Design a protein around this ligand. Structure first.
Ligand SMILES: [Zn+2]
Lengths: 206, 59, 310, 281
């Protein structure tokens, strides 16, 4: 929470060179990967898409892009730290995990351009360790079981998809639940006729 | 005897069958179901033969 | 008004209380206006009572031709279904309660007997038929308020019967319900001794419009709970005993349908009448409906949790 | 308006719903006694499940007017609980409901009054004389902290549900309909179900707002509800639903087993009526 204002004043105070610092801070700020509303400051708007537009480019990468993008584009973006680079790696991993309930190991092994299990699991556990991810790695499946994912970024203007989306999930529950509901309803209706006939006989007895 | 087991006689080995709870239950379940259903129509038609008062007179 | 019946006219209520229409006809009370306090702790204190039988004082009143149960519930006690006049011993509850209930304007007085047979009813058994009969010659207007907790668990409906038993000298006239119910060995004989000595009251329920809105709004966030029953998980090996009992429940029928005694009837003792097959009938119905509970619970949870939509 | 914005306590009890009706019933009682909407007091109890509150059971009480203030007649309530703690021992005095506008210093005062039988009690506010569409229950709780050199308690609100008792639920279904008996049977996790049902109806309106509304374009919505909905329908996995169908097989098996038993039961019933009228052996 602290960093948003922290960067806010930074963008206000800091540009270009000062920016190189802020950007250095922003890169290093977990959760503060994407600017969204944060970019709304004109100062950062200039700072973004600036000479170091590439910085903004990595910003977008945090929003949309991936670590494999860096794999292709080692040069394109501004340079990063091992910490930061593995950060972007985790970024792609979390993203993929969003796509697949359990991302296979080789998926990121190729995606991140990772060699093997030691580092692979180390970073994966680190990612989960941040508590962003839940579950555990799927050893049988060579995947990663996860209960939930902690919010890292905005990821740029997604509003269309996300907004579109809430009802869909709702629809799934609505449809199946309804089916059981109506079956119950019809059953209750039978109850009515059954009780109804029972009452009719009651009337008869008098 | 106690043989809950199998033998690939081509193999020349015994292979103790695992005592099934689930599908053996399914076995007995639908077995008795078919028995009960056969007997359902059976008792229906016996109620018939008794209500219909039919007996095979000897002469 | 919807609140017109929540009005406890202590004047009117205690008037009809001292009215003694029952001594003119013990079938005067045909209705039983109830506020849902009966359902409240009757239900959850028969269920929270485990299997421990209970007893005591109900809040209430009388209106027109109507007994009124403002209260009925359970104890954390035992012994009911076999106690010599059990219920009495919990009246100390509203030996105090009702008293300073008047200090808040609950100017009501004691009217009845709260109780529960956790798992197998809310009523008065053989010794409690001594209880019921003696007390209705003691305490009329008196009722055998009857609802079964685990029956209302595997049944989905509150079989409430206010059973003003037919006092000694007063036989069931045209309207004696006499709700026959499968009783354990302890009291089935004495129920046969006294199964037709009580009638039921037309048990209606009264409330406010706020009451309906509260129940609807209850549902309006309980539906999430509805798809989380989450009913199979609750009775994992429970049903085993159920099954191991249910077939014995079925052997209940066997027990009363096994016999060689030819002759003309039951012709020795009440068997009676071919028997207990109805006992096992209610048994199978309740157990398959609790299976319905588990399966609809977990399956509809799948229907909603596991897959609905994105 | 001395309230203090705090945290949780020790709530967990059991519920039945006419005591909510007795929230209604104390308001009706004091109103008929006074001819006016009476800002009443009532003995809140509830469920406490981890971090969840569920404010459920609270019936008529004594609310005296001390010159402006609602008043728990404290030792009166002591009398009262000893008048029911003999047999209502399954319930404990969590808090007090009332009836009026928003929470006021009289509501604060009787909430403090409830803060004297225990340390951290709960607050409920109902009113049939207020003007909302929501279920009228406000629920407050306490921290103890230090601000501006003053050590003070802290009272703030948390959300609830209502009971999950079988016959209780049956009665709720009836008294709502009075002609439920099947519908919301996912109930242990249906707390989650319909809680987040209303929550996500709110969330649909709420993402429409975060699109836009107020609220501007929102990344909270973006990342958070994105992971949420686009994991959905979560738990739709395979093995998993394989064993779900294994569940279904065993359950339908044994249930239809019992129904077969009942079938041959009525078969024997008919046969015995036969024996009565017809079988001459
Ligand atoms: Zn007795």
């Amino acid at each position: 929470s602290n960093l948003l204002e922290q960067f806010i004043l930074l963008a206000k105070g800091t540009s270009g060179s000062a920016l190189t610092a802020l950007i250095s801070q922003v890169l290093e700020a977990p959760g503060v990967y994407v600017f969204g509303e944060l970019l709304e400051l004109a100062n950062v708007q200039e700072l973004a898409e600036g000479a170091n537009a590439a910085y903004l480019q990595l910003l977008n990468l945090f929003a949309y892009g991936t670590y494999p993008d860096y794999i292709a584009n080692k040069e394109s973006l501004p340079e990063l730290s091992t910490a930061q680079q593995n950060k972007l790696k985790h970024l792609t991993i979390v993203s993929l995990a969003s796509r697949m309930k359990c991302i296979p190991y080789s998926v990121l092994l190729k995606d991140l351009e990772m060699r093997n299990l030691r580092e692979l699991e180390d970073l994966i556990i680190e990612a989960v360790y941040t508590d962003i991810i839940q579950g555990k790695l799927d050893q049988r499946n060579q995947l990663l079981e996860v209960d939930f994912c902690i919010g890292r970024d905005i990821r740029k203007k997604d509003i269309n998809n996300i907004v579109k989306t809430l009802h869909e999930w709702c629809d799934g529950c609505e449809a199946v639940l309804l089916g059981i509901e109506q079956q119950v309803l019809r059953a209750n209706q039978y109850k009515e006729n059954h009780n109804r006939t029972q009452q009719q006989v009651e009337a008869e007895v008098t | 005897g106690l043989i809950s087991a199998r033998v690939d006689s081509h193999s020349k080995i015994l292979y103790a069958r695992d005592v099934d709870q689930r599908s053996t239950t399914f076995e007995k379940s639908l077995l008795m179901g078919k028995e009960f259903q056969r007997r359902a129509k059976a008792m229906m038609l016996r109620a018939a033969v008794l209500r219909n008062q039919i007996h095979v007179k000897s002469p | 008004s919807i609140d017109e019946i929540y009005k406890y006219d202590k004047k009117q209520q205690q008037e009809i209380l001292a009215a003694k229409p029952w001594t003119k006809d013990h079938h005067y009370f045909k209705y039983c206006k109830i506020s849902a306090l009966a359902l409240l702790k009757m239900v959850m204190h028969a269920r929270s009572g485990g299997n421990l039988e209970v007893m005591g004082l109900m809040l209430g009143k009388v209106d027109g031709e109507t007994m009124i149960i403002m209260d009925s519930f359970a104890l954390p006690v035992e012994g009911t279904e076999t106690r010599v006049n059990a219920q009495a011993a919990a009246y100390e509850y509203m030996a105090a309660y009702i008293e300073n209930a008047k200090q808040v304007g609950r100017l009501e007085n004691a009217i009845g007997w709260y109780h529960s047979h956790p798992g197998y009813g809310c009523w008065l058994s053989g010794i409690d038929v001594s209880t019921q009969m003696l007390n209705q010659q003691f305490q009329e207007p008196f009722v055998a308020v009857v609802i079964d907790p685990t029956r209302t668990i595997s049944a989905g409906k509150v079989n409430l019967g206010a059973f003003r038993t037919y006092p000694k000298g007063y036989k069931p006239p045209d309207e004696g319900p006499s709700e026959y119910q499968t009783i354990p060995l302890n009291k089935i004989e004495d129920f046969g001794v006294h199964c037709k000595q009580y009638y039921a009251l037309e048990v209606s329920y009264f409330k406010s419009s706020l009451d309906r809105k509260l129940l609807e709004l209850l549902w309006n966030k309980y539906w999430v709970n509805t798809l989380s029953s989450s009913s199979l998980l609750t009775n994992a090996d429970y049903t085993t005993g159920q099954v191991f009992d249910l077939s014995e429940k079925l052997e209940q029928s066997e027990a009363q349908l096994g016999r060689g005694s030819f002759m003309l009837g039951l012709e020795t003792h009440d068997r009676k009448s071919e028997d207990k097959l109805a006992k096992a009938t209610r048994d199978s119905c309740k157990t398959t409906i609790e299976a319905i509970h588990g399966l609809m619970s977990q399956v509809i949870k799948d229907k909603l949790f596991n897959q609905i939509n994105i | 308006s001395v309230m203090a914005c705090g945290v949780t306590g020790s709530v967990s009890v059991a519920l039945h719903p006419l005591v909510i009706l007795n929230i209604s019933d104390h308001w009706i009682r004091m109103r008929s006694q006074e001819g006016r909407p009476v800002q009443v007091i009532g003995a809140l109890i509830g469920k406490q499940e981890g971090r969840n509150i569920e404010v459920m059971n609270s019936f008529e009480l004594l609310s005296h007017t001390v010159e402006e203030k609602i008043i728990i007649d404290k030792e009166y309530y002591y009398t009262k609980e000893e008048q029911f703690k003999q047999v209502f021992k399954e319930l404990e005095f969590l808090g007090w409901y009332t009836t009026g506008g928003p929470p006021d210093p009289s509501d604060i005062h009787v909430h403090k009054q409830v803060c004297e039988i225990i340390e951290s009690p709960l607050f409920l506010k109902l009113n049939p004389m207020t003007k909302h569409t929501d279920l009228p229950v406000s629920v407050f709780e306490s921290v103890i902290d230090i601000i501006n050199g003053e050590a003070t308690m802290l009272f703030a609100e948390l959300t609830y549900t209502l009971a999950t008792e079988e016959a209780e639920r049956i009665g709720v279904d009836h008294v709502a309909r009075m002609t439920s008996t099947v519908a919301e049977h996912l109930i242990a996790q249906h707390s989650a179900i319909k809680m987040l049902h209303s929550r996500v109806k709110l969330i649909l309106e709420y993402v429409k707002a975060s699109e836009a509304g107020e609220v501007p374009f929102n990344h909270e919505i973006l990342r958070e509800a994105y992971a949420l909905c686009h994991c959905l329908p979560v738990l739709s996995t395979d093995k998993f639903k394989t064993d779900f169908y294994d569940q279904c097989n065993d359950v339908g098996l044994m249930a239809y087993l019992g129904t077969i038993t009942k079938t041959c039961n009525t078969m024997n019933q008919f046969v015995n009526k036969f024996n009565v009228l017809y079988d001459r052996q």
